[PDB]
Amino acid sequence: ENRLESILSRFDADWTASDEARREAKNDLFFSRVSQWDDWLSQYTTLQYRGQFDVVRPVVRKLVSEMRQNPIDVLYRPKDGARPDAADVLMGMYRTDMRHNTAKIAVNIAVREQIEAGVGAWRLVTDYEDQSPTSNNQVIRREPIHSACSHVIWDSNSKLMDKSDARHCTVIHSMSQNGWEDFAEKYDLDADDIPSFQNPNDWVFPWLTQDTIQIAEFYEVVEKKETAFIYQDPVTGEPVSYFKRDIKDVIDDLADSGFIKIAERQIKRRRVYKSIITCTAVLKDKQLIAGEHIPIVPVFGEWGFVEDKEVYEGVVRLTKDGQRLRNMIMSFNADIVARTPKKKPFFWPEQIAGFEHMYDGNDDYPYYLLNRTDENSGDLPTQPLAYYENPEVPQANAYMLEAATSAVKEVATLGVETYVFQDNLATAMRRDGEIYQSIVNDIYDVPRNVTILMAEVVDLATGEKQVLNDIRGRYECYTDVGPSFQSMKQQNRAEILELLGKTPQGTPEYQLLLLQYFTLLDGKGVEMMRDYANKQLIQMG
Amino acid sequence: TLQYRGQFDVVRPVVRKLVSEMRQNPIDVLYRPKDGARPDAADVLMGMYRTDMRHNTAKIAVNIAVREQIEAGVGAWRLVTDYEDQSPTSNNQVIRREPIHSACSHVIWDSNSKLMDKSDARHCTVIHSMSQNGWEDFAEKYDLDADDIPSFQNPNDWVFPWLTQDTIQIAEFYEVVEKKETAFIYQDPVTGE
Amino acid sequence: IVARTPKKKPFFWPEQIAGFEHMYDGNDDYPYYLLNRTDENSGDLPTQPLAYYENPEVPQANAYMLEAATSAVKEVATLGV
Amino acid sequence: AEILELLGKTPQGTPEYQLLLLQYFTLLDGKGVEMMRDYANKQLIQMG
Amino acid sequence: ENRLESILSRFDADWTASDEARREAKNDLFFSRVSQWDDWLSQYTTLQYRGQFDVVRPVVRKLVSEMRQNPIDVLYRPKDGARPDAADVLMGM
Amino acid sequence: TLAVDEIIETISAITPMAQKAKKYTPPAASMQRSSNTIWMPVEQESPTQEGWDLTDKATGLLELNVAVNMGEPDNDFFQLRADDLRDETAYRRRIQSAARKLANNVELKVANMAAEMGSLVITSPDAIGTNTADAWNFVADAEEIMFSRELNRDMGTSYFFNPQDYKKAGYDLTKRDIFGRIPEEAYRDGTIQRQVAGFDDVLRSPKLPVLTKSTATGITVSGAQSFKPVAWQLDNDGNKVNVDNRFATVTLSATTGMKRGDKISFAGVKFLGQMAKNVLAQDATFSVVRVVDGTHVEITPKPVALDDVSLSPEQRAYANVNTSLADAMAVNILNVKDARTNVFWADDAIRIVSQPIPANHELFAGMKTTSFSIPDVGLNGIFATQGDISTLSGLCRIALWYGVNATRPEAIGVGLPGQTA
Amino acid sequence: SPTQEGWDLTDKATGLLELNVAVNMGEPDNDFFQLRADDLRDETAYRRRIQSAARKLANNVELKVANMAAEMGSLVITSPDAIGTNTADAWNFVADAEEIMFSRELNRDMGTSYFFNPQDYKKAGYDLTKRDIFGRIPEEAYRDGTIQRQVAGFDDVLRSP
Amino acid sequence: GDKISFAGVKFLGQMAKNVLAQDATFSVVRVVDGTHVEITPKPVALDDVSLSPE
């Protein structure tokens, strides 16, 4: 019955269910980022040589560079039978608020985590901005999540790569003391009550245990049928559907503006509620957030289910044994090289008694003298001189160094190419586009295009707050994957160039050349060229 | 006593290459008109299929089935229908494709089936495994008594040091009945005799 | 085989190196190695060539079977052509 | 895709111009591509 | 309450958080710039030969030259829907 | 020797009391200097005078308080050998069992504290399964004693049966020779009802203590005594030190056979209506908290007398007992026979203070400390791991620092069936 | 796991103990037939004997389960009188079993089952029917013979012949 | 299959180690000798001072 108890029971179930994959992913990230001698016991004691002759890291670097050379971003496209300009405004808004460094950095972090461990993630958040708002004095931005395996915990009863069927998700936020003070100030919490939350609970090193503060955010999705009011727009048309929950502080002002209620339907849809929690208490209970979907986007590498148990793998998991064997063999060889007596002769003391300064290594003598006789034995026994054998690397050591290196090289071949990883990133970006479309419909100001112009229908309440008015004809565009562009002008330039690349030297080629000059940036000479293109196109009609 | 047990994979790159090659060539249904019918008799069906199969779940299910087909030898997926209001496809409804993990142990076809796609198969049982919360979800969705925890033939195996495994099991039994049933021949007032 | 196998080192009688044990510990402070010569009851230390522990070796059977197993897997893991 | 497949095999006669105009007609929408598609539609209508 | 104490606490927290990475980076800089022989604990013997036959420095030189051959600078572009020459003044500055 | 990974799960315990108890996390920075003790005020009661001429009769203001503190960590220290295989096979399961055992220990502390500092005592001369609706009568007696004393129950009330008495209640329900809805529920399942006789949460608890009988007899109060409500008092140096309101040290003839947990009642003292100050028909019941010395004890409800002439009017406003002790008042013990206690309370009577163990500091190098969220009971501990080669092993320690507190012992109760002989 | 309190715990650590139990299989429950080439011109008797062997093997399996359960069963609830005397006697039996399991805090996540012999099941049904009332449960126990599927909190109740 | 119970020995809670009110009941599974029996629940005592903490 207790809300905290139910939340903790669900979180504990998911935490214990996703355990083995989380530990293996943490081990892979540690192995590829910190050190390959993941031993918690030999961090003290009498020391022995332990080298790090890395052979997997160049492969990870090459794969990361290969996947960075091919950026991917969301592309909104019109649906079937809808207006051909049904995605221009949405695409412009997306390119507006996703051109910042934060989105690119978050995507790159998630990509690197996906290659190394096997799972990465990022988040979509909405913030208030006044200097440069995208729409309705708000911005939608993308934030990174580090160590998604141990920081983002999904519903256990999820059978999809993008976790769109999951109904709740726990995200553990870690922040320093100053960060916790900022968090408390922003969310109206109490600074004196320091929170805490479950941790990965590992052994590996005494360090990396930064003195931090953990809090949890629990996102849950509820699908329900809610009352929706059908209105009559007094400027165009009539059938216009609004949600009662959204239209609740301007319900009286709608009639004053000129809207007349026609009917009242019940429409099924989803809402997302966020809770800020610790283990011992709940700080914020059910703060409703914008959108229909959980704002966390996961990216996976080699992902699947073995026995109703999720497994995700990167590129480093299978090279670990060979790399560790190679490091061990190299350390053994270095020990052999140093702590071994060199090649030197074996002498009885009587043989070189009195000539001990001839063998110290100087070159002042043309030969080496030896004692011949003894006063008791008459003559010293004759035995051929022996020399300590030179140090040698064992054939087993050499053979296994070769075999381990070859095994690591053979097994560290993702694909033939990173096509599967890029397709998984494309799936993640499609999910991101769906989430962003939901948030835009919920909070932004989407103008409807009439064929009679963009008609922005809005109203304000008595508290000087403006409430958005979005009709139910909002899902006119679907999501796809295309090249990453910083602006719609850049996208238009790319499309014009692609068309020019296939159009032969006819009259459409001249048309496209003039259009390319149209879509150019501004200096002075290119300004003159753009003016010439404008005049030519208008003259040709 | 503990003994060294290495793992030097040489098959996994082959599976990765095969999965990448099959992923580079997606394949989808294509509806074409029959012989003597109207030349655009499949436009509506093609549009509806693309509209309700363009989503992420369809591609994910196909990819899961393909990976299991490459590795174990058998995969599967399911087609389900749901009521949608915000963005329906037709008649306030949607048709979506869903994945099935471990198809070999979770989909149990009729033994009297001699077809690769099993179109002559007349019954098929799906084993659904879930934990406590998943069982509550299932009961709430399908209008079942959540108190009486169900059970069925467990298709899983405790062969790894997993801390816990799914303990609740249920079955969906599909059967096909071919029979002659009454139809009415009407007269459409618009045009159709 | 590589890990648990004694390294290549000489075989010594204790009387051969009694008093010179610090010359064979691996340091580099001496130009040669001294060995005892005399035994008070046996007269002279018996002469025999110094023996060394054989270096670790990967068996020919192990190498052959590893290569054969890898080749068989490569030959049989070819879907189609 | 079908129009592009036709264009890849149609030699540069009058059907080539027809298919190019059709591709411009079926192109997506921006501003410049909007102008190009409007021009293609007008040309097709005027050609009948 | 004390501004000095607050500033010092923030600085100390960041300094102790970034301790390992800073140490490794300083060691990397010393290794790549001054000398690869860090032998001060080894003073329990006499003087011995300590050569420095670098094979990593050419790689660093090649990488530095490669990244110098491709200069990168800021470029200001007008926002979508803004005036076509909204960034010329800022670019000139 | 064939072996598998299949686990034969053997135990599954429930923790309702610890779940329902409120958990408090006061600031650790202040608690470090405050000696882990924090004081909270009590709802203020005002006096009343009726008349016209009230010269030199103006009273003062008095606000009493209670103090809550904590105990010591409840660890799970254990050493783990690396070379052994039966340790690598068991490490993670040991961690899980440690979490479960810590939750169970917290629940046990809650139950024992509730059953040992419960002022209100309901007793029965025979077993619950004796007469029809006797379980209902047992619950209703508790509800009535909470109602008559006018105790605040805004947060809610709770009643915990022991399994034997819960079974007896179910048997009484099912032997009704009829089947409505409650009898059919009590037949198909063992549950009697979720709410009974006014309580809004009636459960069963497997971890309720057994109150062993007291051998004390023939004890009388030695010396007339008066207990006065007060907030602070002067120490030797003249500094004012606060006073807890939930304790009172009485002097008896001899405290032999008494322990922490026994229930006593003097002959003559009667409960009052708290707010209205109307004499009840029920004997005042106290719980002996600590047996200090040999002729003194410490009872948890401070017996403030309505007829005490040494009390200022503001102090007398807090009176909860109709009379004082008069140097011969015989004290009757109420637990004259062993019985597994049923425990009822108001939901805001038992709290669980908790504190962090900051072992993540830069001081503790060489060992790794992380957090550890206990399930069931919603608490935090630390999980610390260190290594060693002097024994070639590793030490793992799951620490948890908390403390159960009974802020309103007059709200908690104890049910004792079959207190005959 | 063991547990201890205090801050200073020098030389007070603990080891790890993990107990195990042994599971075994017995000998097969066989069935031999011997037939000549003459006796397989009909094959009907052959198929029938096969089916009868199947059913007999299943029944023998269940008999072994019943004997093992009734022999190696620790908890025992004894009553001084029969189960038909006085009211709610069978319910008191089932409640005693459930209560002792709950008090011992044994694991019941996979479900709990009670099995009556036919005579005791009949006596429980008679106890339900004589209840001088027919609401739903006595009506079911009268019309059919079953007392109820779940009794006194047990997850299932059956009658084993 | 014989069921026995030793006098003065009572069940524990198996998690909270609280003395139950029910006498411990064991079931014999094999009579090896004339003076030895084998009972299926192993009676691990709580007050045994020879038992390690684990």
UniProtKB/Swiss-Prot annotation, chain A:
**Looking at the keywords, is Ion transport present?**
no
The subcellular location is: Virion
Query: What keywords are annotated for this sequence in UniProt?
Result: Capsid protein, Late protein, Viral capsid assembly, Viral genome ejection through host cell envelope, Viral genome packaging, Viral penetration into host cytoplasm, Viral release from host cell, Viral short tail ejection system, Virion, Virus entry into host cell
Any stretches that span the bilayer, and where are they?
Answer: none
**Disulfides per UniProt:** none
Q: List this protein's GO terms for biological process.
A: symbiont genome ejection through host cell envelope, short tail mechanism; viral DNA genome packaging; viral DNA genome packaging, headful; virion assembly
A cellular component annotation (GO) from this entry = viral portal complex
Q: Does the keyword Methyltransferase apply?
A: no
Explain the purpose of this protein: Forms the portal vertex of the capsid. This portal plays critical roles in head assembly, genome packaging, neck/tail attachment, and genome ejection. Procapsid assembly may initiate with a nucleation complex composed of portal and scaffolding proteins. The portal protein multimerizes as a single ring-shaped homododecamer arranged around a central channel. Switches upon genome packaging from an asymmetrical conformation in the procapsid (PC-portal) to a symmetrical ring in the mature capsid (MV-portal). This change of conformation may serve as a signal for headful packaging.
Family membership: Belongs to the p22likevirus portal protein family.
Subunit details for this protein? Answer: Homododecamer. Interacts with the terminase large subunit; this interaction allows the packaging of viral DNA. Interacts (via C-terminus) with the head-to-tail adapter protein gp4; this interaction participates in the head completion. Interacts with the scaffolding protein; this interaction initiates procapsid assembly, thereby ensuring incorporation of only one portal ring per capsid. Interacts with the capsid protein.
Q: What is this protein called?
A: Portal protein
* Part of the whole protein covered: 5 to 580 of 725
Swiss-Prot record, chain B:
Is-annotated flag, keyword Secreted?
A: no
Chief localisation class: virion
Q: Which key words tag this protein in UniProt?
A: Capsid protein, Late protein, Viral capsid assembly, Viral genome ejection through host cell envelope, Viral genome packaging, Viral penetration into host cytoplasm, Viral release from host cell, Viral short tail ejection system, Virion, Virus entry into host cell
Lineage, top-rank taxon, reads Viruses
The record's subcellular locations are:
Virion
Q: Which GO terms describe its biological process?
A: symbiont genome ejection through host cell envelope, short tail mechanism; viral DNA genome packaging; viral DNA genome packaging, headful; virion assembly
Cellular component, GO, one term:
viral portal complex
Q: What's the effect of swapping residue 15 to A/T/M?
A: Overpackaging
Q: How does it assemble?
A: Homododecamer. Interacts with the terminase large subunit; this interaction allows the packaging of viral DNA. Interacts (via C-terminus) with the head-to-tail adapter protein gp4; this interaction participates in the head completion. Interacts with the scaffolding protein; this interaction initiates procapsid assembly, thereby ensuring incorporation of only one portal ring per capsid. Interacts with the capsid protein.
What family name appears in the similarity comment? Belongs to the p22likevirus portal protein family.
Query: According to its UniProt entry, what is the function of this protein?
Result: Forms the portal vertex of the capsid. This portal plays critical roles in head assembly, genome packaging, neck/tail attachment, and genome ejection. Procapsid assembly may initiate with a nucleation complex composed of portal and scaffolding proteins. The portal protein multimerizes as a single ring-shaped homododecamer arranged around a central channel. Switches upon genome packaging from an asymmetrical conformation in the procapsid (PC-portal) to a symmetrical ring in the mature capsid (MV-portal). This change of conformation may serve as a signal for headful packaging.
Indicate what this protein is called per its UniProt record.
Portal protein
- Native organism: Salmonella phage P22
UniProtKB/Swiss-Prot annotation, chain F:
Location of region: I domain: 214-336
**Effect of mutating residue 233 to A:** Cold-sensitive phenotype probably due to an assembly defect
Positions bearing the site annotation: Essential for binding to the capsid assembly scaffolding protein: 5
Q: Its GO CC terms?
A: T=7 icosahedral viral capsid; viral capsid; viral procapsid
A Gene Ontology MF term for this entry? identical protein binding
Variant or mutagenesis effect after changing residue 232 to A: Cold-sensitive phenotype probably due to an assembly defect
Q: Name one GO biological process term.
A: viral procapsid maturation
Record site: Involved in capsid stabilization and maturation: 52
Mutating residue 237 to A leads to what result? Lethal. Complete loss of procapsids assembly, assembles as tubes instead
Where can this protein be found?
Virion
Q: Which key words are in the record?
A: Capsid protein, Late protein, T=7 icosahedral capsid protein, Virion
- Please give the subunit comment from the record: Interacts (via N-terminus) with the capsid assembly scaffolding protein (via C-terminus); capsid proteins and scaffolding proteins form building blocks that assemble to form the procapsid. Interacts with the portal protein.
Q: What is known of its domains?
A: The insertion domain (I domain) plays an important role in the folding of the capsid protein by acting as an intramolecular chaperone.
Query: Which function does this protein serve?
Result: Self-assembles to form an icosahedral capsid with a T=7 symmetry.
Tell me what this protein is called: Major capsid protein
This protein's species is Salmonella phage P22 (Bacteriophage P22)
Write the lineage as a comma-separated list: Viruses, Duplodnaviria, Heunggongvirae, Uroviricota, Caudoviricetes
